[PDB]
Structure formats: structure tokens, C-alpha cells
Amino acid sequence: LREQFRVEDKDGNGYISAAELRIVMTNRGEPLTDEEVDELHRETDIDGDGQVNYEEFVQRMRA
Ligand SMILES: O=[N+]([O-])c1ccc2[nH]nnc2c1
Ligand SMILES: [Ca+2]
Ligand SMILES: [Ca+2]
Ligand SMILES: [Ca+2]
Ligand SMILES: [Ca+2]
């Protein structure tokens, strides 16, 4: 979890941004358009501030 968050947190600012997540999904070859990743990010973003923080990320991985 910790290690995975750091991978996706490209700029190391303690958040996964939507753009960072789009880079992650593109690097993994996930069958999702950019728009669908934006929706995935938005759903993961519990507090709605535009960033996926570590707590929201762990709650994601619990799915
Ligand atoms: O932040 N995310 O919305 C999110 C969602 C699914 C993921 N799978 N692997 N990393 C992920 C990140
Ligand atoms: Ca970041
Ligand atoms: Ca949200
Ligand atoms: Ca919060
Ligand atoms: Ca958030």
C-alpha cells in the first residue's frame, strides 16, 4: 500500500492527482479511457478536494 501510493504519487506531494492516475493507468495498459480514469479518481476522492490522499487510496484498494 505505502509503496504503491509512492509509485503513483509521481511528484511525491502526498497526493495522487487525476493527471498522475491517468499516467499510472496508461503505464499499466488498463482498458480505460482518460475520462473513465477521471471518474475512477473522482469516486476515490472521498472528501472531493481533487486529490486522492493515502486514506482514500487504502479505502480504494479495499474494494
Ligand atoms: O486513485 N485512484 O482512484 C485509484 C483507483 C484504482 C487504482 N488501482 N490502482 N491504483 C489505483 C488508484
Ligand atoms: Ca502527487
Ligand atoms: Ca468524490
Ligand atoms: Ca480528508
Ligand atoms: Ca481527497
Q: What CATH number is attached to the domain comprising 39?
A: 1.10.238.10
Q: Ligand 1 pocket: which of 15, 16, 28, 60 to mutate (most atoms <8 Å of CB)?
A: 60
Q: 28 — phi, psi (to 5°)?
A: -90, -5
Contact 20, 9 (CB under 8 A): yes
Report the atom number in ligand 1 closest to the C-alpha of 52: 1
Q: Output the ligand 1 site: residues, CB below 6 A.
A: 8, 16, 21, 40-41, 44, 52, 57, 60
- For 32, the domain range is 2-61
Cell, residue 8: 503513483
Q: Count of domains in the chain? A: 1
Alpha helices in 9-52 (DSSP H): 18-27, 34-44
CB 62 within 8 A of CB 47: no
> What's the rounded Cα separation, in Å, for the pair 31 and 62?
21
